[PDB]
Every structure is written in C-alpha cells, then in structure tokens.
Design a protein around this ligand. Structure first.
Ligand SMILES: [K+]
Ligand SMILES: [K+]
Ligand SMILES: [K+]
Ligand SMILES: [K+]
Ligand SMILES: [K+]
Ligand SMILES: [K+]
Ligand SMILES: [K+]
Ligand SMILES: [K+]
Ligand SMILES: [K+]
Ligand SMILES: [K+]
Ligand SMILES: [K+]
Ligand SMILES: [K+]
Ligand SMILES: [K+]
Ligand SMILES: [K+]
Ligand SMILES: [K+]
Ligand SMILES: [K+]
Ligand SMILES: [K+]
Ligand SMILES: [K+]
Ligand SMILES: [K+]
Ligand SMILES: [K+]
Ligand SMILES: [K+]
Ligand SMILES: [K+]
Ligand SMILES: [K+]
Ligand SMILES: [K+]
Ligand SMILES: [K+]
Ligand SMILES: [K+]
Ligand SMILES: [K+]
Ligand SMILES: [K+]
Ligand SMILES: [K+]
Ligand SMILES: [K+]
Ligand SMILES: [K+]
Ligand SMILES: [K+]
Ligand SMILES: [K+]
Ligand SMILES: [K+]
Ligand SMILES: [K+]
Ligand SMILES: [K+]
Ligand SMILES: [K+]
Ligand SMILES: [K+]
Ligand SMILES: [K+]
Ligand SMILES: [K+]
Ligand SMILES: [K+]
Ligand SMILES: [K+]
Ligand SMILES: [K+]
Ligand SMILES: [K+]
Ligand SMILES: [K+]
Ligand SMILES: [K+]
Ligand SMILES: [K+]
Ligand SMILES: [K+]
Ligand SMILES: [K+]
Ligand SMILES: [K+]
Ligand SMILES: [K+]
Ligand SMILES: [K+]
Ligand SMILES: [K+]
Ligand SMILES: [K+]
Ligand SMILES: [K+]
Ligand SMILES: [K+]
Ligand SMILES: [K+]
Ligand SMILES: [K+]
Ligand SMILES: [K+]
Ligand SMILES: [K+]
Ligand SMILES: [K+]
Ligand SMILES: [K+]
Ligand SMILES: [K+]
Ligand SMILES: [K+]
Ligand SMILES: [K+]
Ligand SMILES: [K+]
Ligand SMILES: [K+]
Ligand SMILES: [K+]
Ligand SMILES: [K+]
Ligand SMILES: [K+]
Ligand SMILES: [K+]
Ligand SMILES: [K+]
Ligand SMILES: [K+]
Ligand SMILES: [K+]
Ligand SMILES: [K+]
Ligand SMILES: [K+]
Ligand SMILES: [K+]
Ligand SMILES: [K+]
Ligand SMILES: [K+]
Ligand SMILES: [K+]
Ligand SMILES: [K+]
Ligand SMILES: [K+]
Ligand SMILES: [K+]
Ligand SMILES: [Mg+2]
Ligand SMILES: [Mg+2]
Ligand SMILES: [Mg+2]
Ligand SMILES: [Mg+2]
Ligand SMILES: [Mg+2]
Ligand SMILES: [Mg+2]
Ligand SMILES: [Mg+2]
Ligand SMILES: [Mg+2]
Ligand SMILES: [Mg+2]
Ligand SMILES: [Mg+2]
Ligand SMILES: [Mg+2]
Ligand SMILES: [Mg+2]
Lengths: 218, 199, 97, 126, 55, 24
RNA sequence: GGGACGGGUGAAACAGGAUGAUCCCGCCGAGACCGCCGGCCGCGCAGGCGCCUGCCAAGACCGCCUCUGUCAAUCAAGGGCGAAGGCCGGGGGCUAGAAGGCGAUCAGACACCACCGUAUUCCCGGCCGUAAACGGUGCCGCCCCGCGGCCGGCGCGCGUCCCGCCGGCCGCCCAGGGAAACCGGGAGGCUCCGGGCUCUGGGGGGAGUAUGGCCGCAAGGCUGAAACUUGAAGGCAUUG
C-alpha cells in the first residue's frame, strides 16, 4: 500500500463576514484523477466551529456556543461556508439542571423571508425569589402556561420575518436571549432562558446570491 | 360480473361537440349517486376527484394510479386497496409511491390518480363455507376449479405422478430456467417452510 | 420476619405504582423510589494532568469542562460496592448525609 | 496554528485514538490499544493507550499537524457513561508528545429516551 | 535510558503483604512504588518517568 | 419443595388424571 | 477516508474482518421509548398515570346569608372495572428475549456467565379474572398530650413575609394498648367488656386433593369432603 498522502493537497476554509476570525483552517483532499474532481468532492462539507474561536477575546460570553458552517461553493481555491445550524455545548447544557426547580422546553418551526425554514429550540428554568420560606421553586400551571405563551409570541415577534444574515447577527449577539428573558422576567423569577439549538430543516438548492451576500461584506 | 369492487357510471359533457359522454370508474368508498366529481390540473382534494399525483400532498390515499402518464390507470384497482403518496422530488419531476404489496416505486408527476380507496373492502374476511360458494364465485370468472393434485395422477399426466405411495419423490423447488412442462411445484424459491419473525 | 422499617424499604407515599429504572452496574430492574441515587460532578481529565493541559492550551482564558452524571444502583450492588453500609439497629434511623 | 481533531474512544474493552480534519470526512491518524498488547485484558489499559499514542504522534507530526481539539467519549447508548481508564492516558501522552491543545469536549452518545438494554429483569447474576 | 530521580518523602506501604513503598520522587512530583528499604534523600534509577503510581 | 413448584407439579398431575378419565 | 485486527469476559473461547472490518463523517429507512428536571411532589374506584399541539366530556377541594327536605349507612343475589403472563381473529416487527442452538466452567452442568435466536414485548376487536392485586390492617360516625414538613383553596395582619381555617399526604411522640416487635390520624377510649353493617378462622397433616355442580376456546377459575395419620406445628423475643 503506497502512502496516500503523496497525492494530497489542502484548501482553505472561510467563515462568514459576521465574524473576526474567518480562516477556519485547512482541509485535505486527494488530487484530481479518474473522475473525482477535488473541487467536486470537498464541497458540501460541514464544519463545527466554536464562537469563541470565531470572535476571540470574549471567551466567557462566547466559548459555550458552537456554529455549523457548510462549504457551498469553491472558487479561487477557497471554500466558502454558510450557516448550517447552531448548538450549545454539552457541559453548558448539563450545568443547567438542578433539583427543586422546573424546566420548560419548547420549539417552533420558524420560516425566513428568503426560502429557509428552521426549527428553533428554547429552554427556561424557574428560580428562587430572594425572600421566600421554601427551598423548592416549583410553580403552578397558571404560570407555566403564561411562560410558554410568552416564549411563543416573543419568538414570533423577533424571528417572524428575518433573513439568514440578520439571523446570524442576532444568534452571534444573543440579541434574542435578552428579550426572551425580558418578556419572561415579568411573570416569575427565572434564571437562564436561552436559545440552545437551531436546526436548518429545508433550504433551497441554489444559494449563490445568499452566499455572495454572506461572504461579500456587503 | 366477476369483480369484487363496484363500478360507477359517470357522465361528463362532450368537450368537442354536443351531447354527453359516459365513463366507467372504479368507485371510491363514499361515492354516491348525484355526486359532482372533478377532473383536471386544478381539481380540489375530495374523494372521487382525479388529480395529477404531483399536485397531491404527501400522506394521501389514492387509487387507480397510472404508472406512465395518460395510460388511464392500472394500480390499486381491487376492492379495499390504495396507494400512499410518499414524497415529491421536483428537479427530476418524479413522485414516490407505495404499492399495496408494500413495494416503493417512482412514477412521473403528471401521472393521474383518484382520491380515496377502493370500495368493497373486507370481502375476503368471510369464509366460503361450502364447495358451492366456490363454484358460484369461479363460475363468474374462469374454468379454474376444482383442482386435482399432481400426486393424485399417473406419471403420464404430471411429473408428480405415480408410485406405490403418494409422494413427490424429489425436491419440489425447481430452477428459474426450467422449460415448459417442467416448471411445476415451487418456482425459484429463495426459501421455504413456515417460520415466524419476518418484517 | 417481623417488619424491619416503617417505610418498608422505599419512599412510596400516596400512590400505587412508580416507574422502573435499570441498575447501572448489573442492569437489574428496580422501582424508582427504591433505587439508590447519587449525583457526581467531575472533570473529564484527572487533576494530576489538568495543570499540564491548562499550560499546553492555546485559548486565553480556557476552563476545564465538568461532568454531571447521576448514578443509580440496586441494593445488592450498593452494598457490595460499599455505597451504603449495613448498620446497627439504632443507627438505621439516621438520615444524615 | 495547524489544527485537527482527536477522537478518543475510551471503551470498556479497547481504546481508540484517531485524528481527522475539522470536518471529520478525512482521517490522518488511527491507532488502537489492541495493536500494542498480547493479553486481551490490557487493551483498555493506560500503558497500551500511551504506547499507541506514541505512534500516533509520529504519524500526525510527519504529516504536518501541530494542534488538536479533543473529543472524548465512552461506550454510550444504553450502556456505560464513565470513561475507560486509558482516556486520560491518551490525553497525557498527547500533551507530552509535543501537541498543542484547543477546545475540549465530552462526546458520548446519550439517548433522549431508549430501547431496552440486555441482561433481563433480574440482571447479570454473578 | 536510565532516568535517576530523588525521593523527598515516604507515603506508606503499598502491597497487601507490606512490601512496596510509595515515594515522592523528583521539577516534578511523580509518585512511584519502591520494593526495598528507602529513607529520605535517597536515589532511584528510573527506566522511565512516563507513568505515575496509581492512587 | 418451594410451594410454587409443588403447585406446578399438582397442576400437571390433575391434567394427567383428566386426560386419563377422558378415555372412556 | 484510512489500513490490521475487532468483539467478549473474572480470564477466555464461538460469532466478525484485505468480499477493507473495528473507527470518523454525511444521507436514507423502520418501530419502540419519553432521560437530566423526577420529589417523605401530585392525580384516580382500584389495577394504574410523564413528548408537542388541538379537541371532548368529567372530578375532589375550598368560598358562599343560593336550591331541596331525610332523599341516608352497609350490603346476600345481580352488574361493571381489573398489573403481568396466556388464548382467538386481523396488522406490524427496531429492542430485548421463554423455547431452541452454540462457547466456556465443571466430576457432571442439560444451570449461573458469553454469543445467535422463535413465540412474546407494540396496535385494533374480543376473551380470561388471577398477583407478597400489601398498609399482610374492611366501610360509615364520635373523642383524642403535643411538636414539625410538604400540597390545594380561603381569610386577618403588618411592610414578600406572618398568624390562623378547611381538606389531603407524611415524620416524631406523652398517655393508653399489647405476647412482644411495635401502634399511636389507632393497633387507643375494652374482663371497668354492648354506636351500625358485611366477610373470614377454630392444633399439624392428608388437601385445595377426590367427587358433584356452575363458568371458560383452552389454560383455568369459583364452590369443596372423607377415611387415615400425628405431639406438636407456629408467633415475637434472649444468650451462644
Ligand atoms: K390549572
Ligand atoms: K399538565
Ligand atoms: K372445471
Ligand atoms: K385438490
Ligand atoms: K410420484
Ligand atoms: K415469622
Ligand atoms: K421494598
Ligand atoms: K408524598
Ligand atoms: K406519590
Ligand atoms: K409516583
Ligand atoms: K437514594
Ligand atoms: K437488589
Ligand atoms: K490484541
Ligand atoms: K435506544
Ligand atoms: K441480544
Ligand atoms: K441475565
Ligand atoms: K434476568
Ligand atoms: K437474561
Ligand atoms: K433485558
Ligand atoms: K426474568
Ligand atoms: K421477576
Ligand atoms: K429476583
Ligand atoms: K424473574
Ligand atoms: K403460595
Ligand atoms: K406458591
Ligand atoms: K404459581
Ligand atoms: K415535572
Ligand atoms: K412537584
Ligand atoms: K412536577
Ligand atoms: K401530578
Ligand atoms: K405534580
Ligand atoms: K400540587
Ligand atoms: K408530578
Ligand atoms: K343506600
Ligand atoms: K339492600
Ligand atoms: K358495598
Ligand atoms: K357481592
Ligand atoms: K357478586
Ligand atoms: K372486565
Ligand atoms: K381488564
Ligand atoms: K391481567
Ligand atoms: K399472549
Ligand atoms: K420485533
Ligand atoms: K413467555
Ligand atoms: K439444571
Ligand atoms: K442451578
Ligand atoms: K442476541
Ligand atoms: K405467548
Ligand atoms: K410478534
Ligand atoms: K413479554
Ligand atoms: K413490541
Ligand atoms: K388479562
Ligand atoms: K386471592
Ligand atoms: K395471599
Ligand atoms: K407492600
Ligand atoms: K367489607
Ligand atoms: K403549599
Ligand atoms: K398550602
Ligand atoms: K393537591
Ligand atoms: K397552595
Ligand atoms: K395555598
Ligand atoms: K395550607
Ligand atoms: K383542619
Ligand atoms: K383536615
Ligand atoms: K381532598
Ligand atoms: K404521618
Ligand atoms: K392522613
Ligand atoms: K349502618
Ligand atoms: K363486605
Ligand atoms: K373475609
Ligand atoms: K377471607
Ligand atoms: K378465609
Ligand atoms: K365466621
Ligand atoms: K370430579
Ligand atoms: K367450554
Ligand atoms: K386455545
Ligand atoms: K376443557
Ligand atoms: K378443562
Ligand atoms: K415458632
Ligand atoms: K406460621
Ligand atoms: K413458619
Ligand atoms: K418478648
Ligand atoms: K418467645
Ligand atoms: Mg390412480
Ligand atoms: Mg414425466
Ligand atoms: Mg443490548
Ligand atoms: Mg423499544
Ligand atoms: Mg364485567
Ligand atoms: Mg437482538
Ligand atoms: Mg435478535
Ligand atoms: Mg403476551
Ligand atoms: Mg391480595
Ligand atoms: Mg406530602
Ligand atoms: Mg366438576
Ligand atoms: Mg420471649
């Protein structure tokens, strides 16, 4: 067996202009021979990149958020990635749960104004008022229902008609998290309310305009 | 006569002259005399209507489906049968369907179907009690009944015939390329016997 | 065989039936209000190497991720591995953790 | 400055240390604890894990990698969720083989609900 | 390659039958098992410093 | 015996007696 | 993509792999299940009850200067429900897995442990009617030293708290009870014995068996003896 890396050659991977570290890395591939073109095999790869590795310096605010960036067009021997999904980290998720409080999970399918459809998942936790007798923080159904309705109508206001680049701005910024928290602070004490995941359910086939806007600073 | 499901006589207007035009349809269950049915690219989603399978949403029950456009319908025609619409692929312009056997199949998206499932379902759940009921059923169809077993014959009449005890003698799995006169018994069987646990 | 505990060996108050959990050690079926439960929080690298990882990291301000795992055992496994001990008749009434 | 991903599979019976690129589609290193031992009980051990990581260092360095992000996992599914002994051993030999470290993470497959694990209602009767 | 290192303290007898002795050997605090009699300020010639004693 | 298994034995015996009486 | 072993155990051996496995990553399919949160939390007549959204009829409690006028308690016969396994007819079939097969262990091992696997596990229409179906404690009503905890509703107070009331679920405990263990919201108010109603027992075996009857497709269930035999069986507790 001859060494396969005598026929390798790498390409750059590039991140959307929403970020300050756009060289994600290099990626290998086998050179073109037969029918596989290298630029017709490295396309559609999915990369998994930490937000603190894309906006470095704000590690406390950004290290627990992860992005999925899919290359969607190779030109000039550069790969150009595009929004593919958002998730939080496993230890951040595990640290959320205690015993004594209530956990609320919701999701809804949110369309965008340019052909994308998303599933967005939210989490909230009940919290202890400062001057209360008991240790548990359980609340009644009349309150659970108010919190779920608030999450639904709020996310409807912010994300009801957005495009992908504005969405990515908000998701990198936590712009939505603060107003979920704002709307839901008025009902009870609640500790950590956040979007924890976003899943691209169905996108259009041709994204050449979209990616032109995303990488081209525009 | 000879058919389990019923038929519907349906009248349309003559579209190239004056008068009316008469059609026979395999009847979906729930169709009734005096109903108005619709046929076209813009017909609505109602039991009894004829629509291209491309315009029919995933999850739908259809019957009398064409496997190629315009051939006028050849799939899921027997009483109680239907096809499911599984998925649409627009760029290749194909639709995926489930046939009553459970096989999956790609057809064109301009192939037409009828909304619903075939009426007469449950027919085979009643036992035939008597030789006479089988006699009447097959008298309406074909000269195929009653059936004489091969081992009950002499060797001149059948390859299972003869012997001092009734018995086949060799294996009754025969190959796929056997010639006419030889291709009796179980033809090209992947397996045999009665065991559970399939899926 | 008189009765040994007022709680009959479990915490079931005002119901008929409670869920089933598998034991993690031996995989036996145990009711949820009888299973022995503990919560552990531990780093994914030993602390005898957490210093070397933290010196050899590149990220400025990086922190060691923790782990949050709830262990659940049956009575046999708990006693055998010494999560719980057989106690004196007086000591059995103590609920201090 | 040159980044790849190290999947460390710390199983109950074997150990895997495997290096791919950031996408996962392309592999650069693959060693196992059972390619360095004679007795089948020693593959999940720390001496085997380190001794395999010492060959992995050679492969990855000679192909041109200097830093890795670590993804460490257990068996998962319906079974165990604590690591095998040699996972931290792999981390140790990886730092003391020159490599720079980046993002760290647990990556065990855990279910949201589940099918039924083997062994029966009464468990492994030993 | 011999890797001579120096003990800076005795932790205790390790083997079930007495035997071996945990020591704190040395810019490192590696801990190791030792068979024979060892005081403080003594020397061990180490075939390797890669592993540290369990516990 | 364990009473569970004595019960299984007795049931098999009663089944045998009933089969026996069924002849004639 | 990459190239040598992977699985499994206390340790191993049978299954797997250059027909490139184990490992990484993307995509597709199917049927179960509903984690962390999850509890001296909560609901239901018991059996039981945990994904999202919608729809449908119920329920106990509290609050009340609303209506009626004893319409109630318990109950042979009779009717309904009833974990799991099992049966009949349709469907479905991922996991696990009675039976069956096979690798070890062993004196043997037809067992425990490893591996493969059929019924079964899931749905629809029925049937069967049993569990340490347990609080081993029948239902209605009264009186009852006290200290806490949690759950639902209400009211007074100061400036979330705080004190009370009704109902539920729990801990500890004076008296009293008891063979004791323990109970104590009763197992108390009982040789100082009597509020109402229904069911069951009468030394240990033979025996829940034989026999007859009713029910069930079957598997069974329900009802249920006699001859004969025996000096004990059994409860809670003390020392070794
Ligand atoms: K409510
Ligand atoms: K609810
Ligand atoms: K004939
Ligand atoms: K015949
Ligand atoms: K013959
Ligand atoms: K006893
Ligand atoms: K118990
Ligand atoms: K309770
Ligand atoms: K409860
Ligand atoms: K419960
Ligand atoms: K516990
Ligand atoms: K146990
Ligand atoms: K080996
Ligand atoms: K599962
Ligand atoms: K299995
Ligand atoms: K078992
Ligand atoms: K078992
Ligand atoms: K088993
Ligand atoms: K099992
Ligand atoms: K069992
Ligand atoms: K059992
Ligand atoms: K058992
Ligand atoms: K069992
Ligand atoms: K019994
Ligand atoms: K019994
Ligand atoms: K039994
Ligand atoms: K809850
Ligand atoms: K609660
Ligand atoms: K709750
Ligand atoms: K509840
Ligand atoms: K509740
Ligand atoms: K409640
Ligand atoms: K609850
Ligand atoms: K009455
Ligand atoms: K009466
Ligand atoms: K009654
Ligand atoms: K009755
Ligand atoms: K009755
Ligand atoms: K019933
Ligand atoms: K039932
Ligand atoms: K049952
Ligand atoms: K069954
Ligand atoms: K199955
Ligand atoms: K069975
Ligand atoms: K045996
Ligand atoms: K045995
Ligand atoms: K198996
Ligand atoms: K069965
Ligand atoms: K089945
Ligand atoms: K079963
Ligand atoms: K099932
Ligand atoms: K049943
Ligand atoms: K009974
Ligand atoms: K009983
Ligand atoms: K019980
Ligand atoms: K009663
Ligand atoms: K409360
Ligand atoms: K309350
Ligand atoms: K309540
Ligand atoms: K309350
Ligand atoms: K309240
Ligand atoms: K209260
Ligand atoms: K009260
Ligand atoms: K009360
Ligand atoms: K109540
Ligand atoms: K109590
Ligand atoms: K009570
Ligand atoms: K009464
Ligand atoms: K009664
Ligand atoms: K009774
Ligand atoms: K009774
Ligand atoms: K009785
Ligand atoms: K009586
Ligand atoms: K009889
Ligand atoms: K019958
Ligand atoms: K039967
Ligand atoms: K019978
Ligand atoms: K019978
Ligand atoms: K006794
Ligand atoms: K007794
Ligand atoms: K006894
Ligand atoms: K006593
Ligand atoms: K005594
Ligand atoms: Mg003849
Ligand atoms: Mg012939
Ligand atoms: Mg399993
Ligand atoms: Mg399942
Ligand atoms: Mg009934
Ligand atoms: Mg299986
Ligand atoms: Mg199987
Ligand atoms: Mg069954
Ligand atoms: Mg009972
Ligand atoms: Mg309570
Ligand atoms: Mg009888
Ligand atoms: Mg005594």
């Amino acid at each position: 067996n001859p060494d396969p890396y005598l026929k390798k050659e790498w390409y750059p991977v590039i991140a959307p202009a929403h970020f300050k570290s756009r060289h994600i890395g290099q990626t290998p591939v086998t050179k073109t021979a037969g029918l596989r073109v290298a630029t017709d095999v490295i396309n559609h790869r999915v990369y998994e990149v930490n937000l603190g590795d894309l906006n470095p310096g704000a590690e406390d605010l950004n290290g627990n958020t992860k992005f999925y960036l899919q290359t969607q067009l190779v030109s000039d021997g550069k790969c150009l990635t595009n929004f593919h999904g958002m998730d939080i980290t496993r230890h951040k998720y595990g640290s959320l749960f205690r015993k004594g409080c209530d956990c609320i999970d919701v999701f809804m399918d949110i369309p965008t104004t340019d052909g994308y459809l998303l599933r967005v998942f939210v989490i909230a936790f009940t919290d202890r008022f400062r001057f209360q007798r008991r240790k548990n923080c359980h609340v009644k159904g009349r309150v659970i229902r108010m919190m779920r309705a608030g999450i639904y109508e709020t996310l409807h206001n912010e994300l009801g008609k957005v495009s992908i680049p504005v969405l990515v701005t908000k998701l990198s910024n936590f712009e939505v998290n603060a107003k979920l928290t704002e709307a839901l602070q008025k009902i009870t004490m609640c500790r950590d309310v956040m979007i924890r995941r976003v899943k691209v359910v169905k996108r259009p086939r041709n994204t050449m305009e979209l990616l032109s806007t995303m990488h081209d600073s525009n | 006569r000879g058919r389990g499901a019923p038929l519907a006589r349906v009248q349309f207007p003559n579209m190239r002259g004056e008068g009316r035009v008469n059609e026979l349809f395999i009847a979906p269950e729930g169709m009734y005399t005096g109903q108005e049915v619709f046929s076209g690219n813009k017909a609505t989603l109602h039991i009894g209507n004829i629509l291209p399978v491309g315009n029919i949403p995933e999850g739908t029950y259809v019957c009398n489906v064409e496997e190629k456009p315009m051939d006028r319908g050849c799939l899921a025609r027997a009483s109680g049968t239907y096809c499911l619409v599984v998925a649409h692929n627009m760029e290749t312009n194909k639709t995926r369907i489930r046939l009553p056997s459970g096989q999956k199949k790609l057809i064109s998206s301009k192939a037409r179907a009828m909304i619903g499932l075939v009426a007469g379902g449950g027919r085979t759940d009643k036992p035939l009690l008597k030789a006479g009921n089988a006699y009447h059923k097959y008298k309406a169809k074909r000269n195929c009944w009653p059936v004489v077993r091969g081992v009950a014959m002499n060797p001149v009449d059948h390859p299972h015939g003869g012997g001092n005890h009734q018995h086949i003698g060799v294996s009754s799995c025969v190959p796929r390329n056997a010639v006419p006169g030889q291709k009796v018994g179980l033809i090209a069987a992947r397996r045999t016997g009665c065991s559970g646990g399939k899926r | 065989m008189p009765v040994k505990r007022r709680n009959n060996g479990r915490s079931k108050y005002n119901c008929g039936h409670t869920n089933i959990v598998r034991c993690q050690n031996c995989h036996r079926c145990v009711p949820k209000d009888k299973v022995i439960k503990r919560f552990t929080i531990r780093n994914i690298v030993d602390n005898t190497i957490a210093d070397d990882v933290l010196n050899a990291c590149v990220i400025q301000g990086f922190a060691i991720p923790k782990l949050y795992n709830k262990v659940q055992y049956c009575v046999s496994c708990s006693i055998h591995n010494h999560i719980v001990r057989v106690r004196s008749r007086e000591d059995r009434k103590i609920r201090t953790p | 400055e040159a980044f790849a991903v190290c999947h460390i599979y710390a199983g109950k019976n074997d150990t895997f240390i495997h290096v791919t690129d950031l996408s996962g589609r392309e592999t650069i290193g693959r060693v196992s604890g059972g390619m360095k031992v004679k007795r089948h009980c020693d593959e999940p051990s720390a001496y085997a894990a380190m001794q395999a990581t010492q060959d992995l260092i050679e492969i990855i360095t000679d192909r041109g990698i200097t830093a890795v992000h670590i993804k460490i996992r257990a068996d998962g599914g319906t079974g165990k969720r604590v690591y095998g002994q040699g996972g931290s051993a792999a981390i140790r030999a990886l730092v003391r083989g020159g490599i720079k470290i980046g993002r760290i993470e647990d990556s065990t497959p855990i279910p949201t609900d589940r099918t039924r694990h083997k062994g029966g209602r009464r468990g492994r009767r030993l | 390659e011999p890797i001579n290192a120096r003990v800076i303290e005795v932790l205790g007898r390790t083997s079930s039958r007495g035997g071996i002795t945990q020591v704190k050997v040395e810019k490192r605090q590696i801990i190791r098992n030792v068979i024979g009699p060892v005081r403080k300020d003594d020397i061990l010639v180490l075939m390797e410093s890669e592993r540290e004693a369990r516990r | 015996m364990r009473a569970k298994w004595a019960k299984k034995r007795m049931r098999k015996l009663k089944r045998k007696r009933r089969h026996m009486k069924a002849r004639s």
